Amino acid sequence: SGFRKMAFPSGKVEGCMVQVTCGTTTLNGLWLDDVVYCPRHVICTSEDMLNPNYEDLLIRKSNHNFLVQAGNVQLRVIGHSMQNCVLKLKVDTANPKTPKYKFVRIQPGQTFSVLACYNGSPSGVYQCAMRPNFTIKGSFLNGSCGSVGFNIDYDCVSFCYMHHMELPTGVHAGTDLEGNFYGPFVDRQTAQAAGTDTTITVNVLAWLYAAVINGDRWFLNRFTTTLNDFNLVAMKYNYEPLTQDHVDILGPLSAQTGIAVLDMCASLKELLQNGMNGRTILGSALLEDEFTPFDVVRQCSGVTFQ
Amino acid sequence: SGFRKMAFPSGKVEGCMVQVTCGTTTLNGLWLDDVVYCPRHVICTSEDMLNPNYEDLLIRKSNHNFLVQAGNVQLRVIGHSMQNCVLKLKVDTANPKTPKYKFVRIQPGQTFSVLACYNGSPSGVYQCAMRPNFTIKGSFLNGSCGSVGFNIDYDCVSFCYMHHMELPTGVHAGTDLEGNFYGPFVDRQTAQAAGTDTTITVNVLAWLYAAVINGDRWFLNRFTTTLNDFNLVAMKYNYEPLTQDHVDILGPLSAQTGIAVLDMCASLKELLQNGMNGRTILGSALLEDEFTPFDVVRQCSGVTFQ
């Protein structure tokens, strides 16, 4: 019983975090085998960030311009290259703590755990979602750049996010581990801003199923809806359209609870039109959209990771 | 920027989790040096739990009745003893991954991270508080018993909770790592239930300071209050009394924001009397009480742990 925002255990990632310094900038890097991955903006001065040419800036660097520190041990940089917006520093030592891992580019609406780090040292772990507008609502202070997001599948760490910057509204932008930004953002000082966001409908529905599993049904009703009629309401409330693929994904939760997907859609429609009337669901007075269907099944069924 | 429920990095604890089996019961244990700690109810059958005499049950056990598995490796039990409600199994191997650690009994209102585990394998990490009624609102399924709660201070893991059971309302009860229950609970099947709970006032105030730090002031007002007058309202809303020691603890957040503690109390009083009027604070439509003053300072200032 119970339902909490739950992160993956972070130990496999903690053993990969290092500090990278270039000039006056220190940030975090990810050490896997004999390569350290970090944001390429580590090579920039503040003046560079107005309109940097990274190819031109990087060709001017030498290996000894990069200081990599793993705990109390300096790693010697022996090569470097740039892949999109990620810098890859080849070091003379393979990380003995490298876990099984893969790099994965996620879709909006997916969740992941973040290990927030400063000066190469982990500070905390929390759970996030990739918003529809390709930002994350993280918790990051100065020096957090290079911190990573991940999921774990059995024993395999799937890295999906590296933190690059904070946008004017206080939300965060970053890349996959191959250096491609999520969203339209660039690693340059411009007027770029988060676009209008929407609520992740399939996730709200998953969380309503979690609430039923945990023994609360107050928000259910006797109605159903068509997919098309539900999406008319969703659009009105700035919710993402619900697709047939989303309905299919919710199949297992529907089967476990005995509540047809479109019947749960009718309950969400009534919640959107009438509000929660001072009631709560799973300890929240608003509709929560940062649990995926997979997250609900994992927490309500008890999957582990060795 | 940002503010999330943030757990401590769990790697130091992951390396301590093992599986303990006695008869038909399997649960989790904590392996530190050459001792495994677990709930003593592992020795009970379901019939035993109605009215167990643990001294009488344990004297009948042999070392070979306890199966301890660390990953794929069996640890041989070479002795056992009971301390309050915790069983201590001496094993023939010291855990090479034992971190620096201490055992600490916490006060109600304090927070800690939980590493939820099943069959000795970590599943997830989340942040909890010890409620005033000495329960926790965890997320635990069958097999989670023996999972632990902890805080980290520099490099030292302070263990403060071991999970023992779920109460009828779905909340959770357990012990310190020396086997003493929090609250009046016992490791026997009885009619025991959670008492009435209250809201942790000093934590709500800390979270309002976090909101101001992150740039939101909508709920502030021009009023102040006396400590005594505030506590009259707190009692009416089922909030814990605010003590002078709590005011002192909030000193640093007050100094950083320029908002006197009793002025923040006047804002909380107005929030209790008028509600939030459809507004949110730090993404919540209710007043959050599971962040301590220390938690706020850590997340808004950026402390790490090596």
From Swiss-Prot, chains A, B:
The active site is at H41, C145. Changing L205V: In strain: Zeta/P.2. Residues 1-306 form the Peptidase C30 domain. It is found in: Host cytoplasm; Host Golgi apparatus; Host nucleus. Changing P132H: In strain: Omicron/BA.1, Omicron/BA.2, Omicron/BA.2.12.1, Omicron/BA.2.75, Omicron/BA.4, Omicron/BA.5, Omicron/BQ.1.1, Omicron/XBB.1.5, Omicron/EG.5.1. It comes from the Viruses. Residues 1-306 are cytoplasmic. Changing M49A: Does not affect ability to cleave and inactivate human TRMT1. It catalyses: TSAVLQ-|-SGFRK-NH2 and SGVTFQ-|-GKFKK the two peptides corresponding to the two self-cleavage sites of the SARS 3C-like proteinase are the two most reactive peptide substrates. The enzyme exhibits a strong preference for substrates containing Gln at P1 position and Leu at P2 position. Inhibited by pyridone-containing alpha-ketoamides compounds 13a and 13b. In turn, alpha-ketoamide 13b (tert-butyl (1-((S)-1-(((S)-4-(benzylamino)-3,4-dioxo-1-((S)-2-oxopyrrolidin-3-yl)butan-2-yl)amino)-3-cyclopropyl-1-oxopropan-2-yl)-2-oxo-1,2-dihydropyridin-3-yl)carbamate) inhibits SARS-CoV-2 replication in human lung cells. Inhibited ex vivo by michael acceptor inhibitor N3. Inhibited ex vivo by compound 11a and 11b. There is a cross-link at K5, K90 (Glycyl lysine isopeptide (Lys-Gly) (interchain with G-Cter in ubiquitin)). 3CL-PRO exists as monomer and homodimer. Only the homodimer shows catalytic activity. Interacts with host FBXO22; this interaction promotes the proteasomal degradation of nsp5. Cleaves the C-terminus of replicase polyprotein at 11 sites. Recognizes substrates containing the core sequence [ILMVF]-Q-|-[SGACN]. Cleaves and inactivates human TRMT1, preventing tRNA guanine(26)-dimethylation of tRNAs. May cleave human NLRP1 in lung epithelial cells, thereby activating the NLRP1 inflammasome pathway. May cleave human GSDMD, triggering alternative GSDME-mediated epithelial cell death upon activation of the NLRP1 inflammasome, which may enhance the release interleukins 1B, 6, 16 and 18. Also able to bind an ADP-ribose-1''-phosphate (ADRP). This is 3C-like proteinase nsp5. The gene is rep. The chain holds residues 3264 to 3569 of 7096 of the full protein.
